[PDB]
């Protein structure tokens, strides 16, 4: 089990308010401790020195108003650090700039809002932290711009593309984390990893609009399908762990190559379980076994 982002209203409380005994806030906890009612040891208040004994009585029986503002205003500014509304080095300015703002306006209806906004801003950290795990929000809106600009449902050659419409939508829903459909240049493009080692254009996909339905030769790479760019080829291998059945595997490469993209993944996860064993058995071989990779090469070439 794991925690959510360390509670932003509590992190700032951790650094300000008393830890052990706040005699006013934890009143019936000190009162329980002084009445010899605590289950740990009853006479923990009796065996204590007489002077600090009296300090517990004066503070608990007469509750003293402790300063609450600096654990409320800091609760906003540290949430401003976790929601990233300010930079971490900005904690010197905004903490006091708003304290100087409430120095001028201590006593309007604004601070009655402020503590209600404290509960709102602390929840906004918890809302966004669960929302950044699903980076769908900066992805689906971007795909809405892709679906509108690109002409949808126009394969007047042959139609297998209706299945492909949902295939791109499945990539948004299944993996959301680093999967951002960034619109930097006017061509749309999707990143798969946190460092973006396969971020091809979804407008390199515009090469497929004339190749949505053509004739198939035989079983070896086609006499025509050499036109398919390694840019668009990178996309079609990336949608392959998402959609398989739907596109016709016998009419054009939209389906025949998509089934063949599963052959690339099908070998990969087998060889993953192959490599994790031969590398693990290095005590009995005592060599840099590149034959683990050479057999992997042999299991792809000699078929």
């Amino acid at each position: 089990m794991m925690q959510d982002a360390t509670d932003p209203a509590v992190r700032a409380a951790l650094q300000s308010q008393p830890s052990g005994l706040n005699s006013t806030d934890d009143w019936r906890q000190v009162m329980d401790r002084i009445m010899s009612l605590t289950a740990r040891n009853p006479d923990a208040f009796r065996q204590q020195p007489q002077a600090n004994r009296l300090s517990a009585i004066l503070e608990a029986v007469v509750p003293a108003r402790a300063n609450p503002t600096h654990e409320k205003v800091l609760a906003i500014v540290n949430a401003l650090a976790e929601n990233r509304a300010i930079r971490p080095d900005e904690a010197g300015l905004v903490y006091d700039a708003l304290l100087q703002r409430v120095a001028r306006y201590n006593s309007g209806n604004v601070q009655t809002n402020l503590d209600r906004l404290v509960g709102d801003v602390r929840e906004a950290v918890a809302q966004r932290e669960r929302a950044q795990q699903q980076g769908n929000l900066g992805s689906m809106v971007a795909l809405n711009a892709f679906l509108s600009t690109q002409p949808a449902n126009v394969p007047r050659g042959q139609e297998d593309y209706t299945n492909f419409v949902s295939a791109l939508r499945l990539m948004v829903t299944e993996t959301p984390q680093s999967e951002v459909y960034q619109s930097g240049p006017d061509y749309f493009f999707q990143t798969s990893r946190q460092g973006l080692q396969t971020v091809n254009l979804s407008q390199a996909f515009k090469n497929l609009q004339g190749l949505w339905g053509v004739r198939a030769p035989t079983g070896d790479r086609a006499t025509v399908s050499s036109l398919l760019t390694p840019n668009s080829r990178l996309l079609l291998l990336l949608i392959a762990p998402f959609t398989d059945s739907g596109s016709v595997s016998r009419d054009t490469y939209l389906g025949h190559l998509l089934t063949l993209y599963r052959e690339a993944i099908g070998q990969a996860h087998v060889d993953e379980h192959t490599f994790q064993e031969i590398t693990s058995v290095s005590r009995a071989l005592g060599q840099e076994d590149t034959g683990s990779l050479e057999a992997t090469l042999n299991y792809l070439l000699t078929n």
Partner: protein, 50 residues
């Protein structure tokens, strides 16, 4: 007997630690509150009479 001292421009040589600028803005939180305050006294905290 016969002695005199003359003074020029007096200075201050303040030295602190080159703190990490992320930490130098965030470690203040202990002294930013009135809960904990750097309290000091003489060991001979005494008062006399002549």
């Amino acid at each position: 007997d016969g002695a005199s001292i003359k003074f020029d421009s007096i200075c201050l040589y303040a030295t602190f630690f080159p703190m990490a600028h992320n930490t130098a803005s965030t470690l203040e939180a202990m002294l930013r509150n009135d809960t904990n305050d750097q309290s000091f006294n003489d060991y001979l905290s005494a008062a006399n009479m002549l």
